[PDB]
C-alpha cells in the first residue's frame, strides 16, 4: 500500500534550477526520514540528501552541498528537492526513498519512488518522427513495429493498442545518433492470421515535447 509518486523531471539548462517532488501514501509520512538518491545513466546509486521526519535535520552529499535543498511539507505528504546551478554531472534518474528505520540515523531504504530523469543540457527539445516498420511482403509469425526517430531528450514511451498489446513487445534502448538526437524502434510479433482481422497501432509519447502520436502499422 506504500506509494512514492515522483514529479518534476525533464530537461533543464546548465546553470538552471529545477524542483523534484515526491508525494507519498500508505504510511505515516512525518514518522520517517526521507532521502533522495540518484543514478547517472549506466552508473550506480549515489545518495544525495536526507531529511528528518519533522524535519529540522538535513544532510547533504558533498557534491550538492550549497546548491540543493531537501525539504518536506508534512501536511501535504510531500518531499521536495530544489536544485540549483545544475551541470551535466547532475544528469541522472532521481529517486525518493523512505527510511525503514525510525529517527534520523543513517538510513536503509525500504520503499522507493519510481524515479524521474533530469537531463541537464543546453540542447533544445525535439519531438520524434514515427515511421511504420512492416515487411516487404514470410511465415506464421509477423513482425511489426514503429521507428521513433530524431527526438531529444530522453525518454519516450511506446505502447501498443493503448496498452492492450503487451506480449511479444520489445521496445529497444534508444541510440544516440551522430546528429545528437535519439532513435529507437519498438517491435511486436503477432500471428500472421491476425493481420487480416486485428488492427495494430503504436502509441508514442514524448513528454518533454508534449508529443503524442498514434501510428497505424499495416502491411504495405
Amino acid at each position: 500500500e506504500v506509494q512514492l509518486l515522483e514529479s518534476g523531471g525533464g530537461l533543464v539548462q546548465p546553470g538552471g534550477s529545477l524542483r523534484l517532488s515526491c508525494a507519498v501514501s500508505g504510511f505515516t509520512f512525518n514518522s520517517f526520514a526521507m532521502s533522495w538518491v540518484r543514478q547517472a545513466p549506466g552508473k550506480g546509486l549515489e545518495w544525495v540528501s536526507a531529511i528528518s521526519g519533522s524535519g529540522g535535520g538535513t544532510y547533504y552529499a558533498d557534491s550538492v552541498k550549497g546548491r540543493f535543498t531537501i525539504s518536506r511539507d508534512n501536511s501535504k505528504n510531500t518531499l521536495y528537492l530544489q536544485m540549483n546551478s545544475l551541470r551535466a554531472e547532475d544528469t541522472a534518474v532521481y529517486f525518493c526513498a523512505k527510511d525503514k528505520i525510525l529517527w534520523f540515523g543513517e538510513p536503509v531504504f525500504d520503499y522507493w519512488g519510481q524515479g524521474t530523469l533530469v537531463t541537464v543540457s543546453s540542447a533544445s527539445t525535439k519531438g520524434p518522427s514515427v515511421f511504420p516498420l512492416a515487411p516487404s511482403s514470410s511465415g506464421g509469425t509477423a513482425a511489426l513495429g514503429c521507428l521513433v526517430k530524431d527526438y531529444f531528450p530522453e525518454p519516450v514511451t511506446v505502447s501498443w493498442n493503448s496498452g492492450a498489446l503487451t506480449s511479444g513487445v520489445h521496445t529497444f534502448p534508444a541510440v544516440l545518433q551522430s546528429s545528437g538526437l535519439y532513435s529507437l524502434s519498438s517491435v511486436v510479433t503477432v500471428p500472421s492470421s491476425s493481420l487480416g482481422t486485428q488492427t495494430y497501432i503504436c502509441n508514442v509519447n514524448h513528454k518533454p515535447s508534449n508529443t503524442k502520436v498514434d501510428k497505424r502499422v499495416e502491411p504495405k
Binding site: G44, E106, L133, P135, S136, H170, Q177, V187, T189
Partner: protein, 212 residues
C-alpha cells in the same frame, strides 16, 4: 567515507544454481549493511537489511550474512526473474554509500535468433533519409554479428545496434540494427540484406528484400 567493493562485477549462472555475491567495506560497518535488487527501468528493491534480515515479503531464497568488513548475499536457487544488478549499501557512517553493483545474468540454453528485415517507409522517404531495420528476435547468448550488404557490397560505419535487456521470463535477448542511408543512395540500389552469425545457427542466415 566508506568504500564498498562488490565482487564479482558480473556473474552468469543458470536457473536453479546457487549465486554468491560479495561486498567488502574499507572499514568496519558492523552489521549496518543492506542489499538491494534493481531490475531494468525499476527502482531498487530492498532485499536484506542490517546484514542478515530479509525485508518484508522477500522470498526465502534471498539471504544475507557477514559483519565487520565482509558480507555475502546468497540466492539459493536462481530464477530467470532474478536477472538484475545487486547493490550493497552501508549505514554505519555518513554519507551512506553504495557498492558499484554485481550484474547477474541468467544463463539459458542456446536459442537462435528469428531474423526480420524492414525496408524504409514511404513516409520517411519523403524526408531524404532511409532507415533499413534488421531485427534479431529472442536469442541467447547475447553475442551476435550483423553484417549489412547493399547490392552485395559490405557496409561499414553506417549502422547502429541496440540490444534489449535480458528478458525476465525466458532470459533471451533481442537486437535491432539500423542502417541509415541517404534517400538518393537507397534509390540507387536494389538488394538489401542483413546477414546474422550466431552460436545457435549452424551457418549464417541472410534476410533480404528488393527495393520496389
Amino acid at each position: 567515507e566508506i568504500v564498498l567493493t562488490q565482487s564479482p562485477a558480473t556473474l552468469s549462472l543458470s536457473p536453479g544454481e546457487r549465486a554468491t555475491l560479495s561486498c567488502r567495506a574499507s572499514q568496519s560497518v558492523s552489521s549496518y549493511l543492506a542489499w538491494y535488487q534493481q531490475k531494468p527501468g525499476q527502482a531498487p528493491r530492498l532485499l536484506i537489511y542490517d546484514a542478515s534480515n530479509r525485508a518484508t515479503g522477500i522470498p526465502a531464497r534471498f539471504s544475507g550474512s557477514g559483519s565487520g568488513t565482509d558480507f555475502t548475499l546468497t540466492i539459493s536457487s536462481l530464477e530467470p526473474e532474478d536477472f538484475a544488478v545487486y547493490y550493497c549499501q552501508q549505514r554505519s557512517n555518513w554519507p551512506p554509500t553504495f557498492g558499484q553493483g554485481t550484474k547477474v545474468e541468467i544463463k539459458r540454453t542456446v536459442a537462435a535468433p528469428s531474423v526480420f528485415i524492414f525496408p524504409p517507409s514511404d513516409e520517411q522517404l519523403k524526408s531524404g533519409t532511409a532507415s533499413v531495420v534488421c531485427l534479431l528476435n529472442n536469442f541467447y547468448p547475447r553475442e551476435a554479428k550483423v553484417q549489412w550488404k547493399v547490392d552485395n557490397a559490405l557496409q561499414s560505419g553506417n549502422s547502429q545496434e541496440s540490444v534489449t535487456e535480458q528478458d525476465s521470463k525466458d532470459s533471451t535477448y533481442s537486437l535491432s540494427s539500423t542502417l541509415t542511408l541517404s534517400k538518393a543512395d537507397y534509390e540507387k540500389h536494389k538488394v538489401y540484406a542483413c546477414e546474422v552469425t550466431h552460436q545457435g545457427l549452424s551457418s549464417p542466415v541472410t534476410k533480404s528484400f528488393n527495393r520496389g
